[PDB]
Design a protein around this ligand. Structure first.
Ligand SMILES: OC[C@H]1O[C@@H](O[C@@H]2[C@@H](O)[C@@H](O)O[C@H](CO)[C@H]2O)[C@H](O)[C@@H](O)[C@H]1O
Ligand code: CA
Length: 227
């Protein structure tokens, strides 16, 4: 199914070794013309923006190997102004960009170290939408064929809501590879992203996904979860 669940389906890759990290795509996201009220564009909140809307914007980059700690907080000096900044080294993107106003997509697989309930906690300024699980995010080693067909969000955080924070609790199996999609936007001013998790297994919070995030090439037959 494509719907969100407490028991997402995962994937079992064959020989070809998973590559470390997620793939990232960076897109432009403009302010409105000077004098507009507000200065920022609300286009990022169109329900189709994370499916088809972002594609109409300028592609800035596509990179592989995104892993480690992917959290960031970018302090702008003021609102309504394009300002330059850099993503954390973990994003494997060494060029400056308009950190005040941009859209970013991350996708790949999450591999647990434990079998049991995982709670992922997210926050964002302005927006982080998470899909998680086969179908919900995308199909097992059939991502290109299924990437636009993601289902309802497992978790989402929008700056301006009560909390700007959400959680996803899911039962996962260790060593299985779960499709994951993160969709981020900054419309104006400061920008933030937090993505961490805990499990029933202990009281450690994971912020560094060096051993958790992976990429698998698509295959003829796909790589459906065998366990
Ligand atoms: O604080 C993060 C938040 O800032 C937003 O802009 C604010 C806006 O809420 C306001 O009242 O005006 C000031 C002008 O400097 C500005 O701080 C922004 O639109 C959001 O995306 C958040 O980043
Ligand atoms: Ca912002």
């Amino acid at each position: 199914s494509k719907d969100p669940t407490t028991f997402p389906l995962g994937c079992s890759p064959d020989i070809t070794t998973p590559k470390k990290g997620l793939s990232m795509e960076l897109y432009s996201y403009d302010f409105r013309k000077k004098g507009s009220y507000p200065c920022w564009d609300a286009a990022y909140l169109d329900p189709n923006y994370p499916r088809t809307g972002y594609k109409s914007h300028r592609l800035l980059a596509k990179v592989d190997g995104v892993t480690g700690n992917i959290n960031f907080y970018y302090h702008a000096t003021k609102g309504c102004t394009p300002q330059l900044g850099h993503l954390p080294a973990s994003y494997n993107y060494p060029k400056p960009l308009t950190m005040t106003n941009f859209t970013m997509l991350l996708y790949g697989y999450f591999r647990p170290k434990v079998t049991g309930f995982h709670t992922f906690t997210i926050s964002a300024d302005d927006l982080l939408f998470v899909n998680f699980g086969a179908g919900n995010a995308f199909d097992c080693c059939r991502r290109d064929s299924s990437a636009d067909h993601f289902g309802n969000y497992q978790a989402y955080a929008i700056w301006g809501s009560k909390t700007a924070k959400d959680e996803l609790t899911v039962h996962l199996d260790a060593g299985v590879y779960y499709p994951i999609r993160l969709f981020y936007n900054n419309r104006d001013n400061n920008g933030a992203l937090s993505f961490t998790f805990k499990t029933e297994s202990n009281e450690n919070t994971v912020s560094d996904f060096s051993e958790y995030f992976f990429s698998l090439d698509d295959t003829e037959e796909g790589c459906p979860g065998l366990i």
